[PDB]
Amino acid sequence: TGAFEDTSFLVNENTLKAIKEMGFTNMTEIQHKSIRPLLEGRDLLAAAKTGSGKTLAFLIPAVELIVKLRFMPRNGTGVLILSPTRELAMQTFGVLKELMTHHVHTYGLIMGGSNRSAEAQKLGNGINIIVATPGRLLDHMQNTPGFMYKNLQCLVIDEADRILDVGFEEELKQIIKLLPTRRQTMLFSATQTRKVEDLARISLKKEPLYV
Ligand SMILES: [Mg+2]
Ligand SMILES: [Mg+2]
């Protein structure tokens, strides 16, 4: 039973209600493979491509941790999603926007070269789930002082191979280092590369692999 409605206990009803209003009925392969285990709290290494429905795969358990632990603007940041490009960062964010329609928790797109000071003032408020792009996020983490990440629960790395290709290998190593180690970490990459396997060691602990 790969339907979405059988994910009620495991995932908040307000999440399923939104997803039902998105027009989805049944889970894709990676969703079925990934969600159940990710809810339990395992670190995933996924060999996924765009079109697999991987976005929802990582978003459902991400929003779940934020709702479960009842995060507030007070609590700083909870989930951190990394995207190579602005196109994908925005893409993922639009989905997040749809999924958060029946939630009160704070979410924002702290990505791309676009008005740095307005983002800083925004993050100061307390943004629970953040869809971001690496190079700019590190800039906030090193320079924006009122940015709280100490409470981080989930870290998602979308299109890992594509992140390295745009030249963010060092930007990655430096965000991960500065992140609290007690966390769930998810790694999605279409192409299994030598470099990809290396930052997987840095990011993950003992992953359930999914192809
Ligand atoms: Mg660079
Ligand atoms: Mg991928």
Author numbering: 171 to 179, 185 to 386
Relevant lines from the article:
DExD/H-box RNA helicases, from virus and bacteria to eukaryotes, play important roles in processes including ribosome biogenesis, RNA processing and folding, ribonucleoprotein (RNP) remodeling, RNA nuclear export, the regulation of RNA translation and transcription, and nonsense-mediated RNA decay. DExD/H-box proteins often contain accessory regulatory domains and localization modules, but their cores consist of two RecA-like domains joined by a short flexible linker. The N-terminal domain is commonly referred to as conserved domain-1, or DEAD-domain, and the C-terminal domain as conserved domain-2, or helicase domain. Both domains contribute to the binding site for RNA substrates and both contribute to ATP hydrolysis. We used X-ray crystallography to determine the structures of the DEAD-domains of DDX2A, DDX2B, DDX5, DDX10, DDX18, DDX20, DDX47, DDX52, and DDX53, as well as the helicase domains of DDX25 and DDX41.
DDX18 (Myc-regulated DEAD-box protein, or MrDP;) is a nucleolar protein that is specifically upregulated in highly proliferating cells. Motifs Ia, Ib and II seem unaffected by the state of ATP hydrolysis, and their conformations remain unchanged even in the crystal structures in which the nucleotide binding site is not occupied. In all single DEAD-domain structures, α-helix 8 has adopted a position that would block the RNA binding site.
